[PDB]
Design a protein around this ligand. Sequence first.
Ligand code: HEM
Ligand code: CE9
Ligand code: CL6
Ligand code: CL6
Ligand code: CL6
Length: 456
Amino acid sequence: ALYGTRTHGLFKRLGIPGPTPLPLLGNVLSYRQGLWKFDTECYKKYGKMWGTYEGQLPVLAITDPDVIRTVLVKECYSVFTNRRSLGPVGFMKSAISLAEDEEWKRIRSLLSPTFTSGKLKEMFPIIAQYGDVLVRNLRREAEKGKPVTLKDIFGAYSMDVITGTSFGVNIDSLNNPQDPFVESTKKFLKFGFLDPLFLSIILFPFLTPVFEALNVSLFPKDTINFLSKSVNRMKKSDFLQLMIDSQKALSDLELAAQSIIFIFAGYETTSSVLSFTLYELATHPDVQQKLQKEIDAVLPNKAPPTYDAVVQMEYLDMVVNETLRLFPVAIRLERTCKKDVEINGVFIPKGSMVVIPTYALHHDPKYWTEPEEFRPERFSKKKDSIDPYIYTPFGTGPRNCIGMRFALMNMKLALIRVLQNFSFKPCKETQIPLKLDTQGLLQPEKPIVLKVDSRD
Ligand code: HEM
Ligand SMILES: CCCCCCCCCCCCOCCOCCOCCOCCOCCOCCOCCOCCOCCO
Ligand SMILES: Clc1ccccc1C(c1ccccc1)(c1ccccc1)n1ccnc1
Ligand SMILES: Clc1ccccc1C(c1ccccc1)(c1ccccc1)n1ccnc1
Ligand SMILES: Clc1ccccc1C(c1ccccc1)(c1ccccc1)n1ccnc1
């Protein structure tokens, strides 16, 4: 059984500290507390650089901004181009989040004109039309005299926007739970929990070819089929339309992968940050009232938002940027060495992983005074510019979040509407302080519920 004790002497030899890996498992057992908790604990114990093992895969965490800049920007195309080892994914191998090396550079180049600020300005009325249904669905829950579970309200809004901006179909997620789009896309929420299949190829990466050969995918095969068949039937009759017009050619299999992955990526994360932003505005009433004072001063008498009004709301941008500091839903940034590389005078083998602990650097007292406190004033345009390698909620470099500007616009349009019409405050069922759960996509331990009062 030559598999278990092959690489577990690397960091010990290189002089890089870290937790003691168990045979076969590595340090994988330490993840059960959540990657956010494991990363902060390692940061406090070892410092600038530590080393863990996902099975037999060596993982080197780095916290020096000069080193982060080299891995995310300088040597991106040359060493650290790909994110994590390929797993059994089927045709989703052409998804932009999975594509590697030259194939990723090509797919990223084709999709880049779709997510420019110019195309976002053209789609602004499309995104904004989903604010009405959000305010309406939130109005009835407010007049019921009962608390509002934010994940159901903004989860439905996030699915509505991401599907409407992808296919042009105006789903009413909250009022049509039995819709096939809603039930299929709902299964994406299981992402973030324990995945034995994903963990099996982590500990035994040689199983990835076997699973592919047996047509086993890390994605919900039923949901991937519904979306792929839905994408095809629509092409006979938008993110989809922008990708059809672009047809270096984007194949039919590749385009179906990008449509699916954009829905997968935008659904829960947008829903999660939107709930975190409202929790902070409720537990900080003066922060909420000041933000309401800004929206009303720019948009008088509940005026419909325009692009220029949304972009020129500074205090709205500060609140969102601070919610993302406290809760970067993608806890960390990961990269793979496509060759033997020397990082900060340390020789790292090919295929090893480099983790930028975003969450740990976001709560570091060395960079943020009172790091556990929601202070939007950190992102005031008068202070010194925040380090782009310490604050990395969307990552940095050629391979950062391609939908960063879209997600920020999608959330702000929602925040402006709900604040134009409602105020938010806690109640007996609200957890203070907020306890994060162990899920790999940041979620609270108990669902956020807030009292929603209309301003009229
Ligand atoms: C506020 C919500 C969001 C957060 C916090 C977020 C966060 C991230 C992060 C941290 C990465 C990794 C970047 C890196 O490795 O440096 C990423 C990648 C990505 N995100 Fe997002 N994201 C969000 C919303 C979205 C939305 C709405 C979309 C879809 C339009 C999206 C699509 C992607 C894709 C496709 C990638 C992979 C980029 C690539 O590998 O080329 N994300 N996101
Ligand atoms: C032929 C060879 C086959 C090889 C099979 C390999 C199987 C590997 C199994 C080892 C698992 C090791 O687990 C440690 C790593 O876990 C880290 C991530 O998990 C953190 C959260 O869960 C902690 C896991 O350990 C405690 C058990 O808790 C499980 C809770 O799962 C989430 C609960 O939610 C219910 C399930 O999800 C539905 C969500 O709607
Ligand atoms: Cl599909 C995949 C293959 C290899 C590594 C990571 C992923 C990942 C995923 C998605 C669904 C189920 C299991 C793994 C993944 C899992 C955790 C963190 C990042 C990526 N993925 C999501 C988008 N593109 C790839
Ligand atoms: Cl276990 C693991 C290792 C490396 C990357 C991601 C994961 C992940 C996870 C989830 C919750 C707490 C710790 C790690 C994970 C993180 C984000 C999204 C999906 C899975 N996981 C893989 C299989 N089961 C769980
Ligand atoms: Cl892009 C993507 C698609 C499908 C599932 C997950 C993700 C991803 C993510 C988010 C939170 C926790 C783990 C992975 C992700 C996939 C791959 C690499 C980084 C992040 N993501 C959603 C939005 N922006 C990025």
